[model samples]
Target chain A: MSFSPLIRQLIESLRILPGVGQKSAQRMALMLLERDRSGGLKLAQALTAAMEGVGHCRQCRTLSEEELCPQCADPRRDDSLLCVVEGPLDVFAVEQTGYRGRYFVLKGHLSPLDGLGPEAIGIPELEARIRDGAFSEVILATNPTVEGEATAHYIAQLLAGRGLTLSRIAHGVPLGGELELVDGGTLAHALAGRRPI
Target chain B: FSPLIRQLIESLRILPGVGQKSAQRMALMLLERDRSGGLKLAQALTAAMEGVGHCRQCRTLSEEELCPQCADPRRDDSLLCVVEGPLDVFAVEQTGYRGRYFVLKGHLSPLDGLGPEAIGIPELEARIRDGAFSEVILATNPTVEGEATAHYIAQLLAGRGLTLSRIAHGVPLGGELELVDGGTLAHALAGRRPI
Candidate 1:
């Protein structure tokens, strides 16, 4: 009626992965046992290493092993331009676009009722860095959602008249998308901010 | 080596359909709350990898030479169900089948370099010649490779005095005609039975 204990244990362990349930866990366990034992063992080592070694970057608050992430450690990157993003993934996305600016990760947006205010998102630390470091322009690359907007607005207000140029990332319809299928709010924003093309 | 966390996330990506985010989530969950489960999983992986092997009689996965089903005295020796893998044996068992199983472990695919002998068809033939089976059911999949395997086995066993049967192909239970694909509908019509 069931798999042997060891096999069942492997299946149960595999269920820790996001999106994996009983059937998929069973399939993965059987596959590793039957065909790819070496790979499975290698995966175990990786899991152990990542769980033990990975921690937040001291300077940027993104996931990293060292005191500072590769971006913060790099000396050639533009020191005057700072991009404030909501998470580490946004940092990666901006990096892909050849943005040479430095980064500060908030890790979350403001949710005042849930007790996630400016302090929770490291606003004070970000302010200190901007005041002390040689940063002239700061880009707000957070999502355009209500919480993200409020967070960005609060930061702009706090850092006003501090000799910094503040800007938000543009919002518009995505490329290769049908205009008719675009949401009403996005369409309105796109039309309101029409460019002189 | 890279940082342990990076290595763990990268290693977790080896699972089917797992990516960076899911791998990160798995690594964090194991580290934060379930380190014991993670260690146990590692031990289980190592144990299963080293201990498990194919059942000699049926070729299903087993720690022993003969799996429990094959070693059981109550299983009927006169009925044999031929399938593509060990999983198929379990699927057939779920249907309340009392027959013995012969796991091919794979189908004949030239691209994958699996010939008849590679899948142990000759051994299957030898078993059929030596055993006292009255019926052999081809319970392979409905895909092109499975159909070819079934046909190959049927032709090879034609002169033998035994009943050769194939599992049916039709629209699945709870499937609507409109939702069913064209090829499956065609197969259903071809394999239609009288009420």
Candidate 2:
């Protein structure tokens, strides 16, 4: 079937998002114009705003309105308990628990294969912040992947003698789960509670 | 009869969600709606394209004045729900909520490097400070970026003397409100207590 250039362009544009393919993009495009014109306009405007205005927090590496994030700006949060996370979403995951401590978002983990290193992910900055003696506890809340573990160990070792209590979040099997379907949390916890090996 | 009509149809298809068939259907629908309706649509589009701006207060689509939500006196002034986009306001409204809205119109996508000014968060914070809202409900979507945006906004509003809450996981893992059925929406709304 012959497609108009504009229609093709629209389909291509939809592909910019994760997991959208040609057929899905076509369906989405049709649904937008046919069923939700206002939504289409909102999407356009949102895309414009997001592409042009969003930025990173200077202090914590989280997104922010001005120089500092709300957490860093607030005097109530315990600065002595800095929860270090891999990305902004991890901050959200922690916040879901009503965490009252300050946070330091790495924005990424160490991926040496991708040419990402300490400076790339702001490890040096984190070390300096730790050395400043502001935090009594630094919780390594990274994911349960290999990179996450490696990064946590690297930071823990880097901050070993700094008198900061370094701890990793406990991971374990879910309450309703078979060991076969157990996630990294359970495996990690099992490993952590393991005997010398 | 004019090339402008063809051009308009073609241009409409350039949108991220418009396909060739839908573009043609929309053009035909415009024509079938009669000349007056077509003219009105054209006029509205032109006016919005030329004059519409983001609300300085809420970051939602605005004409010369504030967004409809911001200007509505009926909406609860004490409670302000911060969301990722103007469309999200509709989602919340679908729940029959009475609170006003502060549309972020963006989310924190660090991998893509999207930040605050890009999302009109500064304006959102300024509005919160000016209005002295008692509670702020963060209603960003359930996606990774959306969650990040909510946390960032929560952090911004922390210790501002206002109670902050996020929409609960009433939404499924990959569910979007725009795709949700009315019953699910109602359930989510009813189940929503705090956080």
Candidate 3:
């Protein structure tokens, strides 16, 4: 017997994900039919749930199930020390270090060429929140790359003399890296430690 | 030479990613396989489509009334991992994760105009409320839309006391350049985390 049109439509629908080419999609369709039929149904169900119920957290711009994200809503977190980051994953990394401070996710950094200004990156909201005098320290925990640095510098200049002690995450050799291949980190350390450059 | 065979070939060619030449090749291959390989391709296609159905609870594919994931007594029901599709569940299974899954059959693709009703997302909310899962692993692919989809789920599941996490993107199974696709290869090259 030949494959039905409905089956083909299901396979084609699944092939839209990244890295799923035609051949891979076909193989997936075949595999699902051949081995685990339940997985396919579960996939369809979960897709529907996420599409309908999920939205951005209003407070931190992170993914959440409510108006404010978990981190923002937690009273135990130190709101006076707000760490501004580029993404939700960054929050995890910082949390791994036992950071008890609150966070404000930028979702993206400043990219002038791409037309991502302060408003686009939520800097205006950040500035407004800081102006409200809730935070004493605003840590610019952006990445160490060029764009990340530029974004941090822009934030620093904006918040200068505003009574909030601004600092960026330190750049140095990674925790487990050997000294031999630490060229990039070493250079970063030198630049960060540079006197009046 | 038969009209029946010719019609089948034309119909198969209409599938996505199947070109004229590939369709012809597949037709020939099917003919050869039917003659010599004991009609394995035809049998497999027919058997799978006829038997497969979504599991009542977890939404995985199943031949019986319930899927293996849903029926298994030992699966960690407390941690409900959310994935974009069945393939993603398979990928995670490959990693030997023991947690149960809630498969989102479709991801949020606003540019394509696919919304909640199309993807069946309301079911997921009901599942969460009913199951009371403590953690929801957002295992969607690492794309812009995928990220958006994951973020959306995280928000909806927030007040429910569920810990949300996303899958990381990096190199694939094979280290060789030839085996890797362009998007994955570029991501691997750029996001090369120190191993």
Candidate 4:
């Protein structure tokens, strides 16, 4: 007969992880089966535990085990200086910047073509949360990609009437970056928005 | 706070080539999107853990009494291609070589405690004696351990009155000369004939 359904199913399941396509999935499955049975079983157990345990944070839209994330639970973090991000990883990226502000994870950027409108990214909740003027500044830290920029601009337009200081994380040629390696738009932005410093 | 999620992250870290970050990402991804898929994987793990076994004749992994290769009547019994592992068997199969196979499972590495019996050399000798193979091709990997294993096998069947051969070493097809590795280059140069 052909290769077993067990083999096929295991490979298919592995494909849910990022960057894992058919070949990678097969290789992973084969690796676990051939050399690491205990590892394979551990993955299964982990999958079950995490799937049942984890849920979305009601306030931030980040993955969490409870209704509110630790940052949201803590009273010390500055809720008035809210940082908006496209995903949880973005929170980690901004967290590394030592910004002691609370987060509002969008979970995704605008991709209207992909049927991912503002609502899909918890924009309504964001609107409700920000309407009360708890945050003096809302830091839009979405990705630099097309969809992310579009999401940021769209949010800026949505919150136009509000008196809150809406800002976005800056984009330019990075520190110690080579001019040759820098993209044309970034170079143009750096030139156009020249600083006296 | 999330001890259950913590346990999952720890458990997922056991997979080959997976580190803490990768494990966390995988766990999160599974939790976010693939519960049914993960459950299916668990079932696969259960089934494959029990269902898969070494073929009786060739020692290739199989869920049946005999692997498809060993069971096929059309295969030539006179031509036996011995390989180091099931993956090598797969590689050989891709070459369209229609012959019976004998999987060593691993090479003979004494320092690593992989002796003849460990790799099932005795069973191999027994099979060799029982069969009437005119040709026995050694298709082990071209590494130090692989060379040693091939040499050991060659010595074992020195005077068996059968055609003992090893797969040729050459520049790989579509490979560039500048990028070819040192060992392979040496082997290719040494094996060069009047062509």
DockQ of 2: 0.01
Tens digit of per-residue lDDT, candidate 4, span A133-188: 38888889999899999999998999887778899888777899889888899999
Tens-digit lDDT track for model 1 on A58-97? 7777667778878888899999999998877677678889
TM-score of each: 0.76, 0.48, 0.46, 0.89
lDDT of model 2 at position B90: 57
Off by over 4 Å in 2: A131-133, A180-197, B1-195
> Which residue pairs does candidate 1 place in steric collision?
A46-B8, A49-B4, A49-B5, A50-B4, A50-B5
* Deviation in Å, model 2, residue A186 alpha carbon: 4.1
Candidate that would win on DockQ: 4
Model 2 quality (TM-score) = 0.48
**Higher-DockQ candidate among 1 and 3?**
1
Candidate 4 residues lying further than 4 Å off, grouped into runs, are A1-5, A131-133, B129-132, B176-183
Better of 3 and 4 by lDDT: 4
Where model 1 places Cα greater than 4 Å from the true spot, the runs are A19-27, A112-120, A192-197, B1-14, B17-47, B62-80, B90-100, B122-135, B154-163, B170-195
lDDT of 3 by residue, B1-195 (tens): 223334434644434456665654444343322222213333344445566677677665555555656667787888888877666666677788888887776688766777765554787787787886788888877777777888888887777667888777666664678877788788778877677
DockQ of each: 0.35, 0.01, 0.03, 0.51
Please say which candidate is ahead in lDDT: 1 or 4: 1
User: Considering summed lDDT, which 10 consecutive residues are worst modelled in model 1 chain A?
Assistant: A1-10
- For model 4, what fraction of the real interface contacts is kept? 0.46
- Candidates 3 and 4, the one with greater TM-score: 4
lDDT at residue B171 of model 1 (Cα atoms): 97
